[PDB]
Amino acid sequence: MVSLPRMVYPQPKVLTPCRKDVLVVTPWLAPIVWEGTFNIDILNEQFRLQNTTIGLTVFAIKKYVAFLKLFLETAEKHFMVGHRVHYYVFTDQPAAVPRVTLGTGRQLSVLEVCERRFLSEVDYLVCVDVDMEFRDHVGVEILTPLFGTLHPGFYGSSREAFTYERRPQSQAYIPKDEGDFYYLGGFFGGSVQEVQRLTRACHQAMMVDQANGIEAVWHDESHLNKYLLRHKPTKVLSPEYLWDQQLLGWPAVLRKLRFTAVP
Numbered sequence: 001m002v003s004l005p006r007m008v009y010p011q012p013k014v015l016t017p018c019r020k021d022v023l024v025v026t027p028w029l030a031p032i033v034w035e036g037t038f039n040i041d042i043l044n045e046q047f048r049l050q051n052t053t054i055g056l057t058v059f060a061i062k063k064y065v066a067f068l069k070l071f072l073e074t075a076e077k078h079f080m081v082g083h084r085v086h087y088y089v090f091t092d093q094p095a096a097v098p099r100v101t102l103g104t105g106r107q108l109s110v111l112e113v114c115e116r117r118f119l120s121e122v123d124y125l126v127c128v129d130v131d132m133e134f135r136d137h138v139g140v141e142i143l144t145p146l147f148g149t150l151h152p153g154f155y156g157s158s159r160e161a162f163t164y165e166r167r168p169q170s171q172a173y174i175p176k177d178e179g180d181f182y183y184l185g186g187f188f189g190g191s192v193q194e195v196q197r198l199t200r201a202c203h204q205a206m207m208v209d210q211a212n213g214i215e216a217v218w219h220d221e222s223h224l225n226k227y228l229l230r231h232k233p234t235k236v237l238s239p240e241y242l243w244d245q246q247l248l249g250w251p252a253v254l255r256k257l258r259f260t261a262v263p
């Protein structure tokens with residue numbers, strides 16, 4: 001909307017690829033976010049001028065509430081630093097949510113377990129698992145109407161190898177000749193409108209399957225993949241955004257490990 005100010009930065013090189021080791025754009029022209037593909041300074045400017053607010057949702061039920069402290073603490077250090085953030089912790093133990101110190105412009109809501117609420121409080125929703133920790137930058141470069149994340153264990157696999165639901169009976173069914181990538185169920189987001197549409201489509205699909213006495217192989221993640229196949233995400237995050245160093249190590253292709261599993 002508003003004009004950007006004068007900025008000094010390296011001139012993009014038209015005859016010099018960002019990365020020569022990875023695909024940085026999908027066949028439907030959505031960028032694939034890898035370190036080295038973006039100037040965070042330009043992006044921060046663009047989003048700050050819109051006074052962008054990001055909601056981060058996590059479900060911490062039962063034993064998982066024990067991961068909240070490390071989750072929230074690292075988020076404070078690496079998640080959307082400089083922008084307005086609203087954490088939404090859905091838990092069955094409200095009193096167990098640790099008292100974490102938050103930077104200015106950042107708040108936390110504990111909801112014990114209305115969509116409209118999100119519509120008026122945030123511009124984007126980022127949905128992740130609680131048993132994780134941020135180890136590096138995760139900022140506005142991910143914001144877009146709809147985004148999915150490349151699963152750290154299948155990014156180099158062929159589609160036929162993907163663990164999609166393969167039963168024609170299930171709503172999440174995806175034949176062997178279809179599929180772009182295998183997205184993670186633990187890190188997706190976008191505008192509130194798009195995220196609500198995705199979860200609404202998923203909930204309905206899961207119900208239909210339940211009524212037919214069937215449950216997709218990888219449950220929610222299976223339905224997410226089916227939705228993202230039929231509604232292409234406007235951005236795809238690389239495995240940098242959700243990795244497991246203990247299980248997968250640190251490939252050269254990953255210049256940064258931003259969000260990881262807690263061993």
Ligand SMILES: CCCCCCO[C@@H]1O[C@H](CO)[C@H](O)C[C@H]1O[C@@H]1O[C@@H](C)[C@@H](O)[C@@H](O)[C@@H]1O
Pocket residue numbers: 152153154163185218221243244247261
């Ligand atoms: C190519 C061989 C597979 C290695 C990774 C297995 O990852 C698991 O994949 C299934 C889908 O088939 C599901 O997404 C769970 C996922 O496991 C989790 O994520 C991985 C990256 C590790 O962090 C595990 O400890 C998790 O349980």
Ligand SMILES: [Hg+2]
Pocket residue numbers: 017018019036037038
């Ligand atoms: Hg580049």
Ligand SMILES: [Hg+2]
Pocket residue numbers: 057125126127195
């Ligand atoms: Hg969400």
Ligand SMILES: [Hg+2]
Pocket residue numbers: 199202203206220223
């Ligand atoms: Hg669902």
Ligand SMILES: [Hg+2]
Pocket residue numbers: 198199202203220221223224
């Ligand atoms: Hg889903």
